[PDB]
């Protein structure tokens, strides 16, 4: 009647990737963590876009659309910023927002590529992930684009531009003991990278007493959050939700009685 105590192994750690293995854990906790990797991890991405002069062949909210999908460096100040809904002041302050400014005109005959590197921020900690160049739009000679943008703090439930991660691989029971899936012909299926078995045998023998453990993860970052802090931020957020339930739950049990 108590929570199990999990463990972790980190196999590959890079700037694009994390492969870690959680052991001695429930399935629901695993799927819910890999779910928080997507949903609930806060991030900074452009929301509020205002365009002054757009002569480009691409219409306004197409470009304004593509500005929100540009990753911004979230590694630090996300913990500091507040959600725009919880902000005290009207409109925008340095606490709830980050201002980006874009000024481009094509004087030369050759086509100019307007890229994220052209975006200029009021604060040094948020670059448009340039320490190639994400292409915002192209401009023929005489064409011009000038705009303001405010980027906010949000997470993936709202809009997919706030997803901190690329595809998150999740696997358990790679060699199939548990029979949670039944191959009609097991001999036709290639074996997973984590397969523990010889190449002559198709599957592991059926284990009636077993339940899923040793969950294999892969977390591939979009570049906004370094993949080491995606998992930390995720667990911190999920834990924050659970603590909130304990709070308001306790208040209701106290009030109704």
């Amino acid at each position: 009647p108590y929570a199990n105590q999990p463990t972790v192994r980190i196999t590959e750690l890079t700037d694009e990737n994390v492969k870690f293995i959680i052991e001695n854990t429930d399935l629901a906790v695993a799927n819910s963590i890999r779910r928080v990797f997507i949903a609930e991890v806060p991030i900074i991405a452009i929301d509020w876009v205002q365009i002054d002069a757009n002569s480009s062949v691409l219409h306004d909210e197409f470009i304004a659309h593509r500005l929100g999908l540009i990753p911004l460096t979230s590694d630090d100040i996300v913990d500091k910023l507040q959600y725009s809904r919880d902000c005290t002041c009207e409109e925008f302050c340095p606490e709830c927002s980050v201002e980006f400014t874009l000024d481009v005109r094509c004087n030369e005959d050759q086509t100019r590529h307007v890229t994220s590197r052209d975006l200029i921020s009021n604060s040094p900690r948020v670059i448009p992930v340039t320490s190639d160049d994400i292409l915002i739009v192209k401009l023929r000679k005489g064409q011009e684009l000038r705009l303001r943008a405010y980027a906010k703090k949000g997470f993936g439930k709202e809009h997919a531009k706030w997803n901190p991660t690329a595809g998150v691989a999740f696997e358990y029971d790679p060699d199939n003991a548990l029979r949670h899936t039944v191959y009609p012909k097991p001999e036709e299926w290639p074996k997973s990278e984590y397969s523990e078995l010889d190449e002559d045998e198709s599957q592991a023998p059926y284990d009636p007493n077993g339940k899923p453990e040793r969950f294999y993860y892969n977390v591939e970052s979009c570049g906004s959050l370094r993949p080491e802090t995606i998992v930390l931020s995720a667990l911190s957020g999920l834990k924050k939700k659970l603590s909130d339930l304990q709070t308001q739950l306790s208040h209701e049990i106290q009030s109704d009685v």
């Binding site: 949670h180 036709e188 299926w189 290639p190």
Partner: peptide, 26 residues
């Protein structure tokens, strides 16, 4: 197809979205 590491019929193992459990059929 079978040379790239996939089941040659196109069938592929999916995990349920909500509970993360494997979907029995492929």
């Amino acid at each position: 197809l079978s040379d790239y590491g996939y089941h040659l019929r196109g069938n592929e193992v999916l995990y349920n979205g909500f509970t993360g459990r494997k979907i029995t059929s492929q």
